[PDB]
Amino acid sequence: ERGYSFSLTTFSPSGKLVQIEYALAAVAGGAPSVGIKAANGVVLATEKKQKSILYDERSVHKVEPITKHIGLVYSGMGPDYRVLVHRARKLAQQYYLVYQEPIPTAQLVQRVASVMQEYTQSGGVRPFGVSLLICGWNEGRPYLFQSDPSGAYFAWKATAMGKNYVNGKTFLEKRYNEDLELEDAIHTAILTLKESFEGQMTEDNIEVGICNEAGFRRLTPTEVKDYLAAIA
């Protein structure tokens, strides 16, 4: 077969693209994720609860590096996220090949959001069922972006996604402060996750990445263990 040529996302009489709203419902049912932009870096945190202890929790990561200076996390459907991660890495490399410079975070976000938009209008496909938090560092500045299934993107100082993200956003509003440093941001992000977390959090229950001048990196379970011991 060849793919269907007609769009599966169309306007409703009320003016809504209901498939986009349904993909957003899928996103809202995902595992909670949090991003905080500090003065000197960005922290991405996400709940990483496995169904059972049989799962090798250290085999699949939710916090992924796109480039030395760009990482991302998601809420929603994992396989869709893998697709978008692969596309984002390809786009960043293409930018680097043309301009011989690491792609700016905003440019990467715009290109990925363009792909996501394409999946709301092309024939015979559904939208991606994920929302992305993209963190980056360039021009001596940290960047935190969110990109939605519709292909719309926003710049955030702090935000929460996934299950219970409205309470998370209220909590971040109360706690967030532009002047706080990166370690305080990590503490605040873990606290935000704790609000909507079921059971005890361990270094194997959550995943954390940080972006700063040195670059983006996923934190190790030992570092997360130290931060959790401090949080208690």
Binding site: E101, P104, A106
Partner: protein, 204 residues
């Protein structure tokens, strides 16, 4: 030989906190002069210029396509391009025609949009970039320009001294080349201003 068809010469030179870019003015076909005001240096930013020597049609085509790409880049990114990024963009453009190449060898000269640090570079016709700290040259009279620049260039020149150095280099180099000359235009790029001058030059 294809790049000697129209003649021409461009040169760029680095000063202390300034750059200079100069070019001959002749547009001719082989031995015949057609005009004496042909543009070979094109602005690419407030403090960033590209000079193009070689085949005149390719000079014009490359300048126009580069402006196309640069305009789109600056709209999409919302910022002025840095000299090194422009060099990479030009290299990509030229290499795209690796087996059908444009017959021009650009030089770039500018200041960093945020730091105002001097930058110069040159590219061969298929886009190999060469960044230098003193001077670059392109065109039919490259050997003459190399002699003049190797002899006259000094580090950390102030704008007036840079002007005199690049002017003397260009004038004396083109005076020994039959198909380059008919005037010289010089742009001195500084933090606060761009000074454009045309020199008193032999018209034979």
């Amino acid at each position: 030989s294809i790049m000697s068809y129209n003649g021409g010469a461009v040169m760029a030179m680095k000063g202390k906190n300034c750059v200079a870019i100069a070019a001959d003015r002749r547009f001719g076909i082989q031995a015949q002069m057609v005009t004496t005001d042909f543009q070979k240096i094109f602005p690419m930013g407030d403090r960033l210029y590209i000079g193009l020597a070689g085949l005149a049609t390719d000079v014009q085509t490359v300048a126009q396509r580069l402006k196309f790409r640069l305009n789109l880049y600056e709209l999409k990114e919302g910022r002025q391009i840095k000299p090194y990024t422009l060099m990479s963009m030009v290299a990509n453009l030229l290499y795209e025609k690796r087996f059908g190449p444009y017959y021009t060898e650009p030089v770039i000269a500018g200041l960093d949009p945020k730091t105002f640090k001097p930058f110069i570079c040159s590219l061969d016709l298929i886009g190999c970039p060469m960044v230098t700290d003193d001077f670059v040259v392109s065109g039919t009279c490259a050997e003459q320009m190399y002699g003049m620049c190797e002899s006259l260039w000094e580090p950390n020149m102030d704008p007036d001294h840079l002007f005199e150095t690049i002017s003397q280099a260009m004038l004396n180099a083109v005076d020994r080349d039959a198909v380059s000359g008919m005037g010289v235009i010089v742009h001195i790029i500084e933090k606060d201003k761009i000074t454009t001058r045309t020199l008193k030059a032999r018209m034979d």
